[PDB]
Structure formats: structure tokens, C-alpha cells
Chain length 207, copies 6
């Protein structure tokens, strides 16, 4: 893996993307992937043996975990990663498609129109990224208000004969990784905002 | 991995495929693969320890799960993924075969016939994709009517001494991933419909 | 991975192989590998915790499973996959060897003899594939008469104090994958038959 | 993997980095990654079955481990690895970005300014690495004062009916790997200090 | 992976190796690796839960398994694979070393001596392979006289209070894979014998 | 993977290394890596369920294992592998660095000095390898005097109510792999000694 090719792959071979979206948010993307890989590997390993409920009747532990964790933190971040990777995947496919069409048309001004539609597609791609990041911020906030994961919980569900206390295995560890995910996502959000406004002022300065 | 080569691999080196089948449905295919990988990795992990039945006599839990889940969601999606990947795999092999035959014949108009049969093969390839997607829609509908997975079930099978209640571990989580699969498959269906009608009107406009 | 190189690898760089053996049976081979990978990954996972026997005395479950499943379905398919991959592996090594010998001899008609022996080697390679496929059809038939895997079994072995009932975890799921394996193998068989007769009529038409 | 390309990837294609930061601290980085991989693979495997508490009431073992190990050693080292990898990742993206901008501008003195800003960015990159390493030194010190991991601990938490004794599985083994991590991090720190002072005296000698 | 390069890698870039050692025994080597991978993956999985002893006192099962299986079948085959791979690894390094020395000397008859010593090194390489294969045949014979693995065993060791009966999980399955290993190793042996005699008669015909 | 490039990677692109250090000890290094991979994969799998103690009170088994196995055999070999890989890693980085410096200086006798310092660096690299190998020989000797691993042990630690007997799962198997590691390390030691004396007599013959 060479750095020039790796940067070429991460940048989505887009010429309209400036330094922020090809360097800093690319680094943020790689950092968030690495943290997610570590979290899935070790911290959130199977995420069920971590959650123990002080009970002997079967099924109470699973239903209590489901009630208090409707969507797991690591897999919510994985879905967030995929949903924010989709716009970059799409726009990279767009510029690659124009490369293929232009290469085909070479054997057989249009270039100005191609540049304009590529710019517009990239802009809405960043907008969709920002919207997806904001939606996952609100989803994470409503599911888990406190940034730090709760250590001990009280649950009383139908299979459970009475109210019981359940323990989260690594509330502090999962809190640290949650903080890194929240910080990385917030940085990605503000980088998207900077990208959007920077492109707008470039277009306004053009005219 | 470069974007030009990756697009070349995903497009199936087909010249008759237009923008929809080389860009948007390609992105949908990648998105569905990523969601399926996440679902198999974490949400549907072994899918048996997830399903607990409130009983002590052995064998009741397994048979109750088999009755209520004849085919697991994630592996049904995996079979759907393979069956819809097969037409693209086949047509890509077709155009590659014509490339090899034409390259062999170069050393030793036919090209018009090759283009015509490639167009027809690609059309029936998209038709077979659409039929496979529709069949899996009907199969998923009959096996699981409600889009949201049922949380708690009542089963009474021969090994079970009496009727017992069984709990699905993550009904909400599996519901979310089921919604994404249904939405992605529906998008793939309508993209196939658009591809079919677009090619038909192109051929009609040719004549 | 480019399509031209991937087709080149799958075709076994053989010029005497026609469209069937380089395109359709190649797709069938890939499809059977993918289904086998999925079956080993999830459906047949460790294939022992799937088989539960209603007993408490140790060793009865394992011996009952061994009696009713002398050779597991997925690993029987894996051995079938290897034994049918061996002829293609061998003939590809043959044509590669002739490439190396001809390249060595270039530095220092024989080509007609090389083409003839390559044709004969490829023919017996397809014949050996067809025989191996037929043998595994008969082996699978004798070991498992019904295509659908039995759901519940009755076993009485020496460690078992008396006759006990054992449950197969996913008889319907394993039935579906068995159907796909049987269909894929049958398609591979008839494709081999078509390849053999097609080459014979080509040679007869030559003379 | 060739040595020239691997060195090119590790050096971050930076011309202002001298021998220390491209050779010795690169080797230290690889060594720390390998030790971390081994520690996560085997020594710190799931790090929970390692920690056993002499009790039968559920939840006491997990909460006692959380209290005595707020952040696990291996994952703290993983976060340290990522946080010290981020500056090198960033500065490599910076020099790659200038390569792309200069290549784009070639088709259409600035080079002196580019060299100056690259030097400044690399300097603050090493400074941020040194600060991150020092912060993790202080974090590791406060969380775990003694370099050798404690073998046996006494915990008394609310779920635990009374004070109980818990055993760390491999205190000596984890001590050895902790010593290697501390030594490697300290070497990385002093290498960063040498890099900083060496660049400063180079700039002073320039003027 | 192209066939020409894969054959080049498997042949050990040796010009003195004829068709048998570059084609058939190469295929046998690949086949034995694939069977070993399958055996380690599934048939011999952890090979301890497979061996159950009808007892409750701990430690009797492990010591009984150790007595009746001093060296496991799959790992004995793995050691056999490595010990027979070592001569090919060594001789390939030899011919590569002569390539490097000749390339270095080009910048600055010896070639006849290089060819002669390469031939001798390859001959003793095949001899060492044959000896290693024969040794593992005798080792496997003495450890396990019968080719078919024993199904049920009687053991009485110090931890065991009295004589107990232990069950091998898959005696028939492990028998089938043992038969394939024995057949593949025997084929490799006779191929080595053919290689040795063929090279000898070539050298005698030269003089 | 081609043989020329693989040899180039293993040799550390060093011109002062003769046949022993580029061929035989390279093969020994690969052999030791393969044996270590097999040992970690299967023989030493998690190395805790292998060690069973005849007791019911929790924590006695873990502390008894820690006392009798302060450092596990496989991970001690892994640390030995890394510590002997470090000098080759370092010297390969050295020669690569001189390649980069010379390439940079080409655009802008020194070569004799570069060759001399490369020779000295390689010599001390082999010396450090030999010292590390000898240290691990002494460490392994003091931790485990007998080459064959002990089968049964007697331990009496504070958590254990009284003296108890513990069983090592595979003393014979681990003995065989220990013998291979000891033989491979000893061969690597004597190869280092031969390398050192050979280089010394070359330098003396030069002057
Ligand atoms: C603005 C920045 C962050 C854009 C970064 C682009 C990201 C989203 C792109 C760059 C490289 C891409 C990867 C390239 C190749 C593959 C292989 C495919 O089989 C699965 C998807 C996967 C793994 C892609 C996922 C999306 C990806 C990671
Ligand atoms: C219209 C769009 C979605 C077509 C996309 C083409 C898809 C179906 C094609 C593109 C690349 C293909 C992959 C290319 C190579 C391999 C390796 C082979 O050993 C298994 C199949 C596998 C993994 C192929 C599966 C089918 C595949 C994913
Ligand atoms: C007629 C058609 C189906 C022929 C298809 C050829 C098949 C049998 C060939 C094509 C590519 C081959 C693979 C190419 C490379 C390797 C790597 C080697 O280390 C193990 C075997 C393995 C994985 C081969 C197995 C056989 C293989 C899959
Ligand atoms: C001064 C020295 C230590 C600098 C060494 C540079 C390090 C920090 C650089 C060199 C190569 C880089 C790797 C190159 C490619 C990838 C793939 C990406 O998908 C995840 C990050 C990852 C794995 C990078 C992490 C950072 C990395 C390891
Ligand atoms: C006569 C025939 C069978 C010779 C076949 C040569 C065999 C023994 C050679 C060919 C390719 C070789 C492999 C090439 C590269 C590597 C990578 C290295 O990091 C571990 C060893 C390993 C995996 C080699 C093992 C030996 C090997 C498999
Ligand atoms: C004298 C002989 C034995 C020298 C052999 C050189 C050995 C020590 C060298 C040759 C190739 C090297 C590997 C090349 C690339 C990488 C990738 C990196 O991310 C981790 C280290 C790792 C895996 C290296 C470890 C050291 C290594 C194995």
C-alpha cells in the first residue's frame, strides 16, 4: 500500500474536494474505523456476556438487556459508519462513471457540464453526510441521554418474577470509547459544515 | 483498490449497462452487502443463543425456534444476495467470454451480432434479477408477515411438556436491520424496473 | 480483481475448453463454493451443538449422531468440491507446463502433438469430473436417501441406557441448502455431459 | 511487500524527517504494534475470564473488575497507539495533499513556502506525538501506579455480600508485557525529544 | 493469482525438476494442504470436546486422551507437511540465491558448476523429502496401527478411580480423512521415487 | 508472491550478508514462524483449559498454573521471535535508509563509508541476534529445566485449601514442539556464530 494510491482511494478521485475533505476528514474517517474495529473486537465482544442480571430464571437477562439497549452502541456506530460511507462511495462511483463515459467518448463544451454536475453531486453528497451524522447524533442522544454508559440498572419485565438489578460489565471502558465516537462524529460534522460553506463561497467568488 | 478498477469490476465490464445499473444499483448492492455483513457479524450472531425458551427439558428450545423461524433472516438475505449476484456474475462472464473469443479471432459483421446478443443477455439478466428479488419478497412476506420481528412467542411442541413462552433477544435491532434490507431490496427492484424500461425505449428509439 | 484475469484463472488457461466449461460451469462452481461457505459458516456451524439428544448420560449424543450421520453434509460437499476441483487444477497445471516447456524450447510439428495431448488430457479431465460427481451423487443417496434431512430420530446405542429421541436443529434449513447442492451438482453433471459430447462431435467433424 | 515501499509507507513520504523518525522510531512503532497484537491475541484474551472472584452471587466479579481496572491495559495501549498514529497519519496526508496540489498546479517561489509549511506541520506533529505519549504515561501511572500488575485484590462492592478476594490470572505475564510497553513508549518519547531538538538546531544553523 | 506465476511459485523456479515434481506432486501437495485445512477447520476442531470420557472426576478425560493419542492426527500431518515443505523451500532458496549471485556477478565455466551443484542439491532435496515421508509413515503406523481410528476405548489411569470407557466423536469421519492423508502421502512417496530414478537415468544417459 | 521478491524481502536487501544469513537461517526463521503459528493455533490453544486442577474452590487452578508457568512456552517463543526479528528489521531499515539518502543525493568516496558502516551495522545486528537467542536459551532453561514439559504437578497455594494435583493436557505434544523450538533456536545460534566468524575472516583477508 503506497501513500499516493491510498490517498487516491480515500479521496474518491474527486478534483472538487479541497484539503478538508481529502485530508482531515479522511483521517477522521480512518480513526473512527479503527476505534470501531477495536470496540467490536474487544470492548463490545458479543455484548451479552458483558450484561449479567442477578437472576436464575432464564430469559429475564436477555429481555432486560433488550429493553435497556434497543440498539447496541458499537453496531449503531457501524450503521452510522456505513450510512456516512455511502455518500462518498456514491460520489466516487459518479466521478469514476464520468471517467468511463469520457474515455468511451474519446474513441468516438461537455466537459464544463460534467464538471458542474460533479460539483453539484459532491455538494449534495456532503449535505447527505452531514444530515446522516446529525440523525445519528439525535438517535444516540434519545437512546442514550448520558454520554457515559450506565453502570447498574433496575429492570422488571414479565419473565422476571420481580424487579432485579443488572450490571453492565465495562461502563467506564464503554464510556471512553463512546466519548471518542462522539468526538470523532462531532469533528466530522463540523468538517462537513466547513466543506459546505467553503464550496459555496468558492462558487460565489467564481461569479 | 482504485476507483476506476473497482467500478470496472462492479459494472461487469458491460457497455450496454447505463448509469442506473453501473452506479446506483451498484451502490445499493454494496450497501446491502455491508449491512448483511454487519447483521451476520453481530446482530444475528449464531442466532440460537439469542432465542431462549423458558424451559429446562432439552430440545424444546431448538424445535420451537425451528418452527417459528424456518429460515433465518440473515441467511435468507445471504441466499437472496447470492441469487441476485448470479445474473451479474453470469453476464459479466458472458461479456468476458466474447472478449476472449474476439481476441482469439483477431489473430486468425460479427461485431454487430455480438453486441445484439450481449444486449439480449443483459436484458434477461436484469429480468432474472427482478424475478429473484420479487420471489424473495414473497418468501420473506409469507415466512414473516410483519416487518418488525416478533418479540415474544408461545410454542407447544412434542418435546415441550406444555405450552411455553420463548423470547427473541433483539426484536428491535433485528427489526431495524430487516427494515434496511426491505428498503434496499425494494430500491433494487425499482432500479431493475427502470433499467428494463429504459433499455426497451432505447431499442424502440433505435428502430 | 479484474474480470479478464479472473476469467483467465477460472478457465484454466485452456484453449480447447468451449463456452460451457469456461462460463456456465465456472459460474456453477463459484455458486457451489459460495453456498458451501455459507453452509459451513452458519447453517452447519460445528454441527454438534445442532444435534441434541434427550439424555443425561454422557456419550450417547455423540455416538447417536455418528451412527445417523457417518459423514456430515457440508464436509461431504467440501470433499466433493475438492475432488471435482482436482481435475481442473491438474489440467491447468498441464497447459501451464506445456507453456513453460514451449517457452524453454523457444530459446533453444511439435505444436500439433502438444495441442492433441492437451485436448485428450482435457477430455479425460472432464470425464474424471463427471465420474467424481456421479460417485458423490451415489454416496449422498446411500448415506441420506431422502433429500430433506430428517428432523427427529430414534437411537439406541450401547452407552444409551435405552432408546432415546434426538433432534436435528435445522432440518428445514439444511434441507434448503441440500437442495441447492443437489441442483448445483446435477447442473454440473449435465454440463460435463454436454462438454464431453460437444468435444466428441467437434473431433468427428474435424475428420 | 518490498522494503523500499514499506519504508516509503512508514516514513510518511516526508523529506524533512531525518534518520531517527524514519528508521528507529519506525522500528519502535512496528515493535509496539506487534507486542500489542500478541497481548490482545493471547495474554489479554477477553480479559474477563482471566479475572476470577471467589464468590457465587452474580455481578460481584464484573463490578470488582471494573473498579480495579477502569481501563484495560491492552486497550489503553491500543488507544495510545491510535492517538500517536494520528499525527503521522495527518502529516502524511498533508505532504500527500501538497503532492496532489503541486501536480495539479503543474498542468496549469511557492515551493519554498510549501517546504516551510511542511516543516512546521511536521514539527507540531512530533510535538503532538510527544504530548500524547506523555499524557498516556501519566494516565497509566495514575490508573496503575506499580509497573507490575497486582496479583490478588480485595474488593467489597454493593452486589458483593461482603469483602471478597479476586485473582488476576497472569500478573507476571501481564507485568512482562507492561514492561515492554513502558520501555517502548519511553523510547518513543526520547526519540521524539531528539527529533524536536535536532530539527530546531537544523533551523537555527540554517539562519 | 495467475496460473503461470502460481506454477512458477510452486515449481520453486527450478529448471532441473521435470514434469512429475512440477505438476503431479505439486497437485498432490496442494490437495494435501486443502485436506489438512478442512480437517483442522471442522473434523479435528479442538479435538478435545470430540473425546468424551464417561466420568465425573476431573482430569481423567484429558489424561486418557493423552495416553491414547500421544500426537493428534491433524497436527502430525501438519508437522509432516512442514517437514516435507522444508526441502522444497530450501532448494527454491538455493536457486534464488544463485540467481542473485549470478545477477551480482553480471555487473562485475562457472555456469556449468552452478548447474551441477543445483542438480545435486535438488536430488538430495527429493531424497530428504522421501526420507521424511517414510519416517512419518512409520511414526503414524506405530502410533496408530489401524488406518481406521478406534471408536471406543478403555482407559484406567491414576486420576480415574477405575477403568472407564471413552468415545471418539467421529471415528468414521476421521477414518476417511486419514485414508486420504495416507493415500496422498503414499502417492507423494512414489512420485519422489520416480523423480529420483528419472534424474539418475538422465545423468547416466548424459555420460 | 514470487521467489525472487520473497528472497529479496527476507534477505533484508543487504549485500554484505552471505549465503548462510540469506538462505539457511532465513529458512530456519520461516520454519520457526510456522511451528510457532501451529503451536499457538492448536497445541497451546488458550493454554488454560489445557491445565486442569483437581479442585472445586475457584481460583486455585489459575494461581497454580501461574506459579508453575510464569511465562507460557508459546508466548515466550513469540517474544523470542520478535526480539530476534528486531535486528533484521532494524538493519533492513538501515540499508533502505542509505538507499533513500543515496537516491536523494544523486539528484543533488562517500560510498565506501556507506559500505563500511553498513557492514559494521550488520555485524552488530548479528551479534545482537546471537545475544538475544542465548538470553532466551537461559530464560527457557531456568523457567523450564527439563526439555520435556512436566505432565502432573503438585501445588499448594493460599486459595487452595490443601495440596492438590494438576494435569497438563498435552505434555507429550508440547514436548515435541518444545524440542523443535529448541533445535531451531540452537541452529539459529550456530548459524549466527558461523556468520560472525565468516565476516571477521573476510575483513581480515581484505587487509
Ligand atoms: C471523505 C472521505 C472520508 C471519503 C473516504 C471514502 C470511503 C467512504 C471509501 C474509500 C475506500 C472505500 C472502500 C473501497 C473498497 C471496498 C470493497 C468493497 O467490496 C466493500 C466496500 C469497500 C471497503 C469501500 C467502502 C467505502 C470506502 C472506505
Ligand atoms: C449490477 C451490479 C450490482 C453488478 C455487481 C456485480 C457483482 C454481482 C459481482 C462484482 C464482483 C464479483 C465478485 C468478483 C470475484 C469474486 C471471487 C470469487 O472467488 C467469488 C465470487 C466473487 C466475490 C464475485 C461475486 C460477484 C461480484 C460481487
Ligand atoms: C471448469 C472450471 C470450474 C475450472 C475452475 C478451476 C478451479 C478448479 C481452480 C481455478 C482457481 C484455482 C485456485 C487457484 C489458487 C489456489 C491457491 C492454492 O494455494 C490452493 C488452491 C487454489 C485455491 C486453487 C484451487 C483450484 C481453483 C479454484
Ligand atoms: C514516525 C512513524 C512511526 C510513522 C509511521 C506511520 C504510521 C502511523 C502509518 C504508516 C502506515 C499507516 C497505515 C496505512 C493504511 C492504513 C489503512 C486504513 O484503512 C487504516 C489505517 C492504516 C492501517 C494506516 C494507519 C497509520 C499507519 C500505520
Ligand atoms: C515440489 C513442490 C510440491 C514444491 C512446492 C513448494 C512449496 C513447498 C512452497 C511453494 C510456495 C511456498 C510458500 C511461499 C511463501 C510463504 C510465505 C512465508 O511467510 C511462509 C511460507 C510460505 C507459505 C511458503 C511455504 C513453502 C511453499 C508452499
Ligand atoms: C536473517 C533473516 C531471518 C532476516 C529475515 C527478516 C525478517 C526478520 C523480516 C523480513 C520481512 C519482515 C516483515 C515485513 C513486513 C512486516 C509488516 C509490518 O506491518 C509488521 C512487521 C512485518 C511482518 C515484518 C517483520 C520482520 C520480517 C519478517
Amino acid at each position: 500500500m503506497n501513500w499516493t494510491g491510498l490517498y487516491t482511494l480515500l479521496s474518491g478521485v474527486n478534483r472538487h474536494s479541497t484539503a478538508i475533505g481529502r485530508v482531515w476528514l479522511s483521517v477522521i474517517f480512518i480513526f473512527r474505523i479503527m476505534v470501531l474495529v477495536v470496540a467490536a473486537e474487544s470492548v463490545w465482544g458479543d455484548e451479552k456476556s458483558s450484561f449479567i442480571c442477578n437472576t436464575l430464571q432464564p430469559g429475564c437477562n436477555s429481555v432486560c438487556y433488550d429493553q435497556f439497549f434497543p440498539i447496541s452502541h458499537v453496531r449503531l456506530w457501524s450503521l452510522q459508519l456505513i450510512l456516512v460511507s455511502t455518500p462518498a462511495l456514491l460520489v466516487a462511483m459518479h466521478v469514476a462513471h464520468q471517467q468511463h463515459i469520457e474515455k468511451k467518448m474519446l474513441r468516438l463544451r461537455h466537459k464544463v457540464h460534467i464538471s458542474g454536475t460533479l460539483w453539484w453531486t459532491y455538494v449534495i453528497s456532503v449535505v447527505f453526510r452531514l444530515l446522516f451524522e446529525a440523525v445519528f447524533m439525535y438517535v444516540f442522544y434519545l437512546l442514550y441521554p448520558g454520554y457515559a454508559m450506565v453502570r447498574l440498572v433496575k429492570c422488571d419485565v414479565y419473565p422476571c418474577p420481580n424487579t432485579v438489578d443488572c450490571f453492565v460489565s465495562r461502563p467506564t471502558e464503554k464510556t471512553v470509547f463512546t466519548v471518542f465516537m462522539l468526538a470523532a462524529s462531532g469533528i466530522c460534522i463540523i468538517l462537513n459544515v466547513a466543506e459546505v460553506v467553503y464550496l459555496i463561497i468558492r462558487a460565489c467568488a467564481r461569479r
